[PDB]
RNA sequence: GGAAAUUAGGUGCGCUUGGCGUUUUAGUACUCUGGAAACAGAAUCUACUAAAACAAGGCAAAAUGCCGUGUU
DNA sequence: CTACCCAAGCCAAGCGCACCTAATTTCC
DNA sequence: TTGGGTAG
């Protein structure tokens, strides 16, 4: 039939509501669910990618230093340098002789940790933060008379350690020390100047941001030109043309001419500047003064400033005129007419200055110009600052209309329109459905991008199954992400705690239990300092408590135009003032005779109220002092745009995409958005359950409410004015009072259909991506007990943190797990003493150090033992793991990584018994065009699971795939335990965590299913994006993945 | 609403580095044994320093070498 | 099996371009 | 939230 589509677009969900356009009965409703596309995910990938390069290039630096030492025959395979201490050698080499083994180990150590380059220049007063800027400053002061190696050696002898936060130095300080060392060791070893040059180079050299990665990288570029051209944007009017450099000469001339052509001069002659005038202006004030002032242009044209209007202006109110940057930058170093009067050359100098990023490359590229530039000039030009960014137009666009700017008075947009040049757009005439490719182009957040792409796919599926709707109404989340969302929640709860405490304070003080029924009026009362804002008369709290009906909550701006139901549009006033005011603004009401006070007296009170701590809302101030005319349509448009509709950038982009698609394919579909604040008002007034603990269906419930709102706006003729604005159609009945407003929207008994609806559908996005995180980073050592079991060795760090009770619980439950319990028991007894004395304290080690200022030290008869900074203890028995012991030679024990991230599991039915094979991310291998499962790993896993050749493959299960275990349908999380045949699932219509909360069940909030001989049946289900269920069938395990 | 410009603020993608962190091994300290000491042996607990590995792995051949946790 | 338990790499410094917001001038 | 070992 004819239907209205409502969309609730969220961070992790897209809820849709389908309701009849006439009957207002719900056809269908559901939720599309997916993971939040938060920026930290890709940040993690980029961060790891950067870390790999750092480690790779650091290693490559060392190898080259060693390869250099090999070539000069200071190092051999046979040469042994193990006992040597670099800090001792590096200091000794500064004034004495070193062995070929002792000298090289000093050079190698320097090459490994070479310090920073960029931080160097600027000192920072020490706020005692562990900042690089602060630390570098602190070391420089302490490096005044000493070299780096010297200072480190002193710290080593004096403090016992070198490494840490302090070990941050400038690269120059290392190089300075290296140079001195090489100068002294120069006499004792046969080295040429090529040696000392190559090493210093190797020590200090690092890639630049514009140089990028090496030759192979898909992230790299061939040269600086290709690098910049890829990044820079394209012209608005010529898409094929690259933008001009922001400060090209012709670009700024274009800017200056637009300024002059926008001017209006009041005089007997023409009000617009003639060509000869603009020529004189450009030459006599623009090419003469760096920052042209209004006076200079006025003096040139022989009028006063007051006669000149229509000029760009700064926030101070001072005129802003285009600065000819290149012209003056070059003029200052050279006044030769050969250079300055050459626009083309000035253009080329600007481009070179902007594209390339260092003086040296600038010089070379400037030299390649074969201009009339003196080399002395070129070197001077290369140090010019501020050549960054692009103009929004190409030189092609700029040069084309430059004469027109000179000889007409039309600005750029007037000329472009006259020339029939339209800003580039994307055609959707060919598209069979609403495209998803365009989303990134107009989006800022990764979170919003995914939500939009999913939203579009939801729409495309709905129109395919249901046909086109007349109306699409959309609401977006207030939060940009979940972290931001949680912050909103915290502030909400905190405010609630404050108000709830305030109410308790009143019932204890007055004994009037009525206060819990007057929260909003009390909130207003406290916020308004106990005065009626319209009469400025005092509102005694006792009278408010006893007779609350005498004091009315009035809406500042009438909701007939404001559509604002929030606390910001509410004021507690006397019933008499609220009655007299009617459908007016405070300004309109207080201007009339009906009012007790003048608007000025009112304005004064509000302004003082709006300043200071606990002040009135800023939005409230803007409302209370609204002096525009409410009946003016333009003003009504502003309020609708602020409070009734969603005019945020992301919303506009998506909405325009939909409208553009429909208009081009000539589809009569009306698209609109709605402010979340207004829908919340509806849900509140339509008496929906306050506590949203029903699970995912709330998203579909919201979309139905959103769809119902669209229905209401198309039902009434008084809402036709507002409906028109929401649908953005070009251009009367209207809501006249507060009471009328309530009648139209507060209709709780007309939406029972929504609440009674119980046919919600759910769609969970399935993840099948290969090569995600393969395994946890942490390296673990192992031990073998007397029983023969290999045990994981864990570390206890942060023993002196306040809230760290890990050690206390460990000793009370299992002291024998401490390796220190078996070896060095003297220290254990020393620890146990500390533990027993502060048993009540969460961390006995914290309170100790807090009181003594000293840490637990290893036992020594001389009381000179070392501090204990972390304690090893035995963990669980080793099982599922990654053996990487081979990376560590002659290691007495196994070295492992843990948590083998599963890709999927394949269920087999083997002789009436269900079993499954766990496919790890480690088992999926990449090829140039595709991923494939390791057959040797799969068969091995098949054998370890005792799967037989007779067994038949049932299905594969990825994350969020639907599974029916013994007749109950769940969604797959993943393999929880391969060895114990335990897979983890969750509920489809709700989280299992919340399900237990509703039941007040204290069981662990995780569903673990065991696939064993007691398992009766396993089926694989799936859904469309709308949440419609269906069963699947397959014959063999997919071993090839395309990516 | 759209076009250009000026200032301030913000978001993302990409690049370039720093010092940590985990682990092994070696040396030293610490503990234990013998000894007048030197020193040797044991232990590998705690600490410091150096060398090496750090998503499994895949390329690549003197290289400011390259890829491997994102999206679809 | 149920009902537990544990533990999971991290900060700081540059840079390019794209995009957005707010304010100001003109015009379409 | 999730790999996965543990007590009973
Ligand atoms: Na480009
Ligand atoms: Na620049
Ligand atoms: Na009055
Ligand atoms: Na940025």
Short mmCIF file of C-alpha atoms in Angstrom, two decimals, chain A residues 415-565:
data_model
loop_
_atom_site.label_atom_id
_atom_site.label_comp_id
_atom_site.label_asym_id
_atom_site.label_seq_id
_atom_site.Cartn_x
_atom_site.Cartn_y
_atom_site.Cartn_z
CA UNK A 415 31.13 35.97 -14.65
CA UNK A 416 31.02 32.19 -14.19
CA UNK A 417 27.23 32.21 -14.40
CA UNK A 418 27.27 34.46 -17.45
CA UNK A 419 29.81 32.08 -19.00
CA UNK A 420 27.45 29.17 -18.26
CA UNK A 421 30.03 27.44 -16.06
CA UNK A 422 28.32 25.37 -13.36
CA UNK A 423 30.01 23.88 -10.26
CA UNK A 424 30.75 20.17 -10.81
CA UNK A 425 28.02 17.74 -9.72
CA UNK A 426 27.49 13.96 -9.84
CA UNK A 427 24.79 12.53 -12.11
CA UNK A 428 22.56 9.78 -10.74
CA UNK A 429 20.50 9.24 -13.89
CA UNK A 430 22.22 5.98 -14.80
CA UNK A 431 22.09 4.54 -11.27
CA UNK A 432 19.52 1.78 -10.72
CA UNK A 433 19.59 2.27 -6.95
CA UNK A 434 20.81 4.81 -4.38
CA UNK A 435 24.64 4.69 -4.59
CA UNK A 436 26.84 4.01 -1.55
CA UNK A 437 30.14 5.06 -3.13
CA UNK A 438 29.47 8.78 -2.70
CA UNK A 439 29.17 8.59 1.09
CA UNK A 440 32.86 9.10 1.95
CA UNK A 441 33.07 12.19 -0.28
CA UNK A 442 30.74 14.22 1.95
CA UNK A 443 31.48 12.62 5.32
CA UNK A 444 33.92 13.46 8.12
CA UNK A 445 33.52 10.62 10.63
CA UNK A 446 34.23 6.90 9.98
CA UNK A 447 31.36 6.14 12.37
CA UNK A 448 28.86 8.23 10.44
CA UNK A 449 30.12 6.86 7.12
CA UNK A 450 29.28 3.26 8.03
CA UNK A 451 25.92 4.28 9.52
CA UNK A 452 25.08 6.08 6.28
CA UNK A 453 26.19 3.26 3.99
CA UNK A 454 24.11 0.79 6.00
CA UNK A 455 21.19 3.25 6.07
CA UNK A 456 21.23 3.57 2.28
CA UNK A 457 21.33 -0.21 1.84
CA UNK A 458 18.36 -0.46 4.21
CA UNK A 459 16.45 2.04 2.07
CA UNK A 460 17.37 0.30 -1.20
CA UNK A 461 16.17 -3.03 0.21
CA UNK A 462 12.91 -1.58 1.53
CA UNK A 463 11.96 -0.01 -1.82
CA UNK A 464 12.84 -3.31 -3.53
CA UNK A 465 10.55 -5.35 -1.27
CA UNK A 466 7.82 -2.73 -0.67
CA UNK A 467 8.05 -0.19 -3.48
CA UNK A 468 8.53 3.57 -3.27
CA UNK A 469 7.15 5.50 -0.28
CA UNK A 470 5.74 9.02 -0.54
CA UNK A 471 7.56 10.10 2.61
CA UNK A 472 10.97 9.34 4.09
CA UNK A 473 11.68 10.85 7.51
CA UNK A 474 15.10 10.47 9.14
CA UNK A 475 16.64 11.05 12.58
CA UNK A 476 20.36 10.86 13.37
CA UNK A 477 22.17 10.32 16.66
CA UNK A 478 23.26 13.31 18.73
CA UNK A 479 26.50 11.50 19.48
CA UNK A 480 29.33 11.27 16.96
CA UNK A 481 30.62 8.11 18.66
CA UNK A 482 30.10 5.82 21.66
CA UNK A 483 32.76 7.50 23.82
CA UNK A 484 30.98 10.81 23.21
CA UNK A 485 27.67 9.07 23.89
CA UNK A 486 28.87 7.73 27.24
CA UNK A 487 30.01 11.22 28.21
CA UNK A 488 26.50 12.53 27.54
CA UNK A 489 25.09 9.74 29.71
CA UNK A 490 27.50 10.49 32.57
CA UNK A 491 26.59 14.17 32.59
CA UNK A 492 22.91 13.19 32.47
CA UNK A 493 23.21 10.84 35.45
CA UNK A 494 25.29 13.34 37.40
CA UNK A 495 22.68 16.07 36.92
CA UNK A 496 19.98 13.61 37.97
CA UNK A 497 21.92 12.81 41.16
CA UNK A 498 22.20 16.52 41.92
CA UNK A 499 18.49 17.20 41.41
CA UNK A 500 17.50 14.06 43.31
CA UNK A 501 19.71 15.18 46.20
CA UNK A 502 18.20 18.67 46.01
CA UNK A 503 14.71 17.16 46.29
CA UNK A 504 15.69 15.02 49.31
CA UNK A 505 17.09 18.16 50.93
CA UNK A 506 13.70 19.87 50.54
CA UNK A 507 11.60 17.03 51.97
CA UNK A 508 13.93 16.88 54.98
CA UNK A 509 13.83 20.66 55.48
CA UNK A 510 10.11 21.32 54.96
CA UNK A 511 8.55 17.89 55.49
CA UNK A 512 6.58 18.49 52.30
CA UNK A 513 6.75 15.23 50.32
CA UNK A 514 5.05 17.01 47.41
CA UNK A 515 8.49 18.07 46.18
CA UNK A 516 9.00 14.82 44.25
CA UNK A 517 6.02 15.79 42.08
CA UNK A 518 7.33 19.29 41.39
CA UNK A 519 10.87 18.56 40.16
CA UNK A 520 10.64 20.58 36.91
CA UNK A 521 9.08 23.58 38.66
CA UNK A 522 11.69 23.37 41.43
CA UNK A 523 14.48 23.06 38.84
CA UNK A 524 13.18 26.24 37.20
CA UNK A 525 12.73 27.93 40.56
CA UNK A 526 16.34 27.39 41.67
CA UNK A 527 17.63 28.38 38.25
CA UNK A 528 15.60 31.61 38.24
CA UNK A 529 16.74 32.55 41.77
CA UNK A 530 13.18 32.24 43.09
CA UNK A 531 11.65 34.97 40.94
CA UNK A 532 8.91 35.02 38.31
CA UNK A 533 10.83 36.22 35.26
CA UNK A 534 7.85 38.06 33.72
CA UNK A 535 6.80 40.10 36.77
CA UNK A 536 10.15 39.97 38.60
CA UNK A 537 8.14 39.33 41.78
CA UNK A 538 9.41 36.78 44.30
CA UNK A 539 8.17 33.19 44.21
CA UNK A 540 8.27 31.85 47.80
CA UNK A 541 9.32 28.19 47.64
CA UNK A 542 6.87 27.36 50.45
CA UNK A 543 4.01 28.81 48.41
CA UNK A 544 5.25 26.95 45.34
CA UNK A 545 5.35 23.72 47.36
CA UNK A 546 1.89 24.24 48.87
CA UNK A 547 0.19 25.78 45.83
CA UNK A 548 2.08 24.76 42.65
CA UNK A 549 -0.99 25.37 40.49
CA UNK A 550 -0.59 29.13 41.05
CA UNK A 551 2.76 29.05 39.24
CA UNK A 552 2.77 28.07 35.58
CA UNK A 553 5.55 26.62 33.46
CA UNK A 554 5.41 28.87 30.42
CA UNK A 555 7.13 28.33 27.08
CA UNK A 556 9.33 31.34 26.27
CA UNK A 557 8.97 31.12 22.50
CA UNK A 558 5.51 29.74 21.56
CA UNK A 559 5.94 26.15 20.36
CA UNK A 560 3.67 26.93 17.41
CA UNK A 561 6.81 28.41 15.83
CA UNK A 562 9.66 27.32 18.12
CA UNK A 563 8.85 23.60 18.21
CA UNK A 564 11.06 23.52 21.31
CA UNK A 565 9.92 21.36 24.22
#
